[PDB]
Amino acid sequence: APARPAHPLDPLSTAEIKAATNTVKSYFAGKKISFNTVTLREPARKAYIQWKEQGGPLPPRLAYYVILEAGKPGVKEGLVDLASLSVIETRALETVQPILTVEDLCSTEEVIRNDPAVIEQCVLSGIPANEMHKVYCDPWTIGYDERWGTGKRLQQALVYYRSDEDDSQYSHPLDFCPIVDTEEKKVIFIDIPNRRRKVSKHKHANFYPKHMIEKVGAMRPEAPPINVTQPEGVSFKMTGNVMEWSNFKFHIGFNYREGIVLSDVSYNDHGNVRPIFHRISLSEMIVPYGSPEFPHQRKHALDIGEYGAGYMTNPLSLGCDCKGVIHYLDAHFSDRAGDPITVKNAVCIHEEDDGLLFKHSDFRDNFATSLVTRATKLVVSQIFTAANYEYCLYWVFMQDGAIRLDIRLTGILNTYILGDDEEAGPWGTRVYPNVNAHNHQHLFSLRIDPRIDGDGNSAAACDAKSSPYPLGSPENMYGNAFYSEKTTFKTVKDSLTNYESATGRSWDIFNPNKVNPYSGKPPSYKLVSTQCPPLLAKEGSLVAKRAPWASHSVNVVPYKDNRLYPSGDHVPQWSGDGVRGMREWIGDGSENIDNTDILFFHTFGITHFPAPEDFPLMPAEPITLMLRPRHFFTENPGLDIQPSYAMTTSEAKRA
Amino acid sequence: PARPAHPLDPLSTAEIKAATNTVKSYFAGKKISFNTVTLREPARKAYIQWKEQGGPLPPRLAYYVILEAGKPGVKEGLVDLASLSVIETRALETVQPILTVEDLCSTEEVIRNDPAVIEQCVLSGIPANEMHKVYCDPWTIGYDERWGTGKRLQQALVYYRSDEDDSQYSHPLDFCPIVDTEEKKVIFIDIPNRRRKVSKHKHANFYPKHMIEKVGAMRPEAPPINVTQPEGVSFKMTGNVMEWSNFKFHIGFNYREGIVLSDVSYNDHGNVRPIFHRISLSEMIVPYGSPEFPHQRKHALDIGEYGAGYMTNPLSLGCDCKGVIHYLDAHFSDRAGDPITVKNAVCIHEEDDGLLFKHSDFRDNFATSLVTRATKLVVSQIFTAANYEYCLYWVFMQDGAIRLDIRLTGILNTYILGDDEEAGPWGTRVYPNVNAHNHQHLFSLRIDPRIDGDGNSAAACDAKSSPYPLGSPENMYGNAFYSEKTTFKTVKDSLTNYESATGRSWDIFNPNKVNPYSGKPPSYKLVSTQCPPLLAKEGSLVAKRAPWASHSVNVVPYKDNRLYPSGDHVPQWSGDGVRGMREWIGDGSENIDNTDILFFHTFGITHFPAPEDFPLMPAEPITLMLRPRHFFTENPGLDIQPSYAMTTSEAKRA
């Protein structure tokens, strides 16, 4: 009954969310339910393509839902057909726990503030029982605790203290960790260390201007401004969610979990519109902490699956986050009651100056002969907040046909208390008195659904190698011979591969059915990514079992519908045992992945060893990966862009 | 002359003139030409004494290199400018020096008029009267064991243009003339066993008039993106001294390294703290990967063979630096000893750099929020090495990091490919009859550190899992991990490569000092992952002429004049002998812990060409960064005005 959208990948409108919740409420009449997730169920890949390109059936508009029911363990999930307002698919899942929404997180603080056992711990730690309004917490999922499994829905409250509401609480962690039952709203346990450490008596480590004035005397004067103006408008064109820019076309989607989803990406190669990717997104994360001491093993957040890069996203406009002529998109979710909620300006789109695209000058007339073309890049960005952390996400299209993911980490370190006589090392750093910032890794799983110049793709590893022939042979007289060794993956097992400095390893995604007429190589997009940490948690560890994708830089599996989330559909409190998510998709490693519909999951990120520079608030730390056309074109695709400056040899002779 | 303000300033045009008059008169009655006339930088100890200890103002000195007609090799030495005298000299009969703009310019005329060359063109299918259509790129010979350093030699890489406006690289010829640079005479031509004649295809061109023919039309002019600074800039220049966002340093420039950054300090709330004494690019090598003759001679060491100063583009004419720019000029000597000037060789500006930091509280729906935006300072040059473009950006940032960004553009070096000829596995057929050979581009970053003062060390930092196994009392859940730090004791310890298996980084630190919070020494941390292994084999010509290239990191003791890791005079050295990095390494046993050190970092890329790269290549990026870690006690940027800030208390009031 709701109006269907312009485009089948368009996110659910507020009206569609509302229709969905009404329908689901009616199906479960008399049962006390709440809504965890109401989100688009995207159309099967075959149907979307058949619709888009073959005059095919229009795909059903579907809402996927996850609910809880009071007094029932676990969740229910299902699908609503929006045209007919009915529930077409249903199941109860009594042994999983679902993503934690903003409403789940905001509850927990008032729960621990009112708990007599927590209050008593605060008293023993040096906070008087009448000042519980000053105790705050970051309510994480418990993550995984073998004492409860998925038997109850749990959060672990990492507790802190503020002397004033404007303080940054992270200089003042407390020593204990309350375990809260999310649905009953009660503290069921508190992890208490053997060595007590009372609340720090130092000043809070603050960072607003009033705080800096006191700490350092004065603020630096306001800098003279840099202004950016586009008086004739922008060169990109939006039609609903569909973007066109510098020959690129694609759909900008968004959802509670992944945040930005770019679909149906193609490039217009002088009138021939060539597919590149069907879908590209961040599909999961894991942030594993490296202190072995109890209970710090429970810090290994899989932020996308346990909280959501959509649900956590910041409204962008007030902050001055995106500078210049900006196009915004809003996100729409359900709340607990089933009412649409909106986050305004969730996504910001703009184009920027990107330096030189290409330059060449001739030494013969002293660089008089010269051609110089400037580069513009298209940025589609979101920023999300995961308690203490900020993740800035920028998807970047470039004028050479390349596509790049840029990330900047900022926000504040997770911190735990440190005794006056306590050494942080080797597992963490003393970033401020009485403050221990544990070592950790931030790891991301990029999901790529490729369609390189069409259907039937493959992937390889490409390793730079010296010729096998020795120096002074006929084949390699001066020892200088080298090549690129290309290892095509045949089955899933062959693809499980790590980045390797010793070969400067890249990965190709390519179309074996086609051939570049100049070079004779298949057309390809090449993954060029060097920020690929190995997983430092040991095999069989809780971190490695809960993120089976993260132990390889690259995982390539057959395409199947609904293979989005590589640690499973319902991540919180999964032990990491069982065949689900990546472990399921890998299977016995034998399925074909040569010239077929494939998915390519790429683990990248950083290993962070904190230092005082990071504190009390951390300077942006950049991460990046690129996908470059290699043998996709027969020549530089930017040559038809007007140069900033051009003089030929004959024009230069004339002057 | 008059002395300049600052002892690190490059030589003025007057001073170069003064330099070459003095050398003219000391070699009175001799035909000599000038190859280099340039600042000899004062000893690091002299300089620091003048700067900080009331010490006398160092003497203004000029380093020169000259050739004398009829004499092998070169002569080099030093001129004391204040007394117009030669104070040091010596003759190097068995080296060859850096190739100047003019030594390059005369080769084409030499080969166009040479009769064996003319004959090779005819057999290649170009008539003897179309020789104005034959071009070459005049490289050093690099090294050829048929002549050593016994003659000064170039190798002319030959191309063909149908029209002077063509880009010549779609049309290489098959043969390679060898030219005596000083006799202006071709002495040999390398001719392959299988001849391949000039391509019949159209040239692969890239000017808008060519593109109009090739694809119908140019894209419409895009809507402008304009950058103004109505109130001017935040940085302040005094002569060549830069002040910005608490950094202070001197911007120098010479013929070989191009940009040289000296005396780098950071003003930490009134405490002026040293970071580097000097940083610059000190050498390159660009080893091609085709084993076939004569292509083993493609391995240009661009900095020592041609000079990133000598090769640099005037900027501004092209729209190379967008915004409100401050420019510096370069000054050199030509062959006759007269000052030449390259206008606008260096550009200085500030640009937006995204967010510096941000944090919002989820508790009031992100209404509690602070956002501060980043500005970066860019000091750059662009140089042309025949077909290649190298864009160099030294970047300072407001978290106190220094980054080097490089962008590679220009044109693929190409060689001819036959109709039936397969280019793989040593190159790519990027256009019909065009073979673009595999190659690496390697750079030697030279750091003379002075981290929070004198007495420094360097280490490798390697992320590692705990050695204790999953299930033990020490690592119950198997997640513990730490950074293993390996302090380099002796030169040999430092010889290290980037390691993905540990995400290796390198520290340059002051072990005499201590961070009050963390208890670690103050450090700048080299974060760099574009660290290709040298693919050329041990004992190869490449590995011998670039001994620094075989390790990502090489740390050696400071001595004055330890600048150029492939030796002072690079063209035609075979790579045998104890000089440059090989001399500085020695037997490997010298101390590098807590002393004056030099840190030489090898980084860059391995290039397997693709058609996207032809006929003109899109910028390929290379970066490395040096980040303060345990240097400060907190984020140094917090005193910068936020672009937006709202407290929890303010958010309630609204």
Ligand SMILES: NCc1ccccc1
């Ligand atoms: N990375 C853990 C997290 C996210 C959001 C809220 C609490 C904790």
Ligand SMILES: NCc1ccccc1
């Ligand atoms: N890179 C080789 C080279 C440099 C400058 C001029 C000619 C050739």
Ligand SMILES: [Cu+2]
């Ligand atoms: Cu971190």
Ligand SMILES: [Cu+2]
């Ligand atoms: Cu290259």
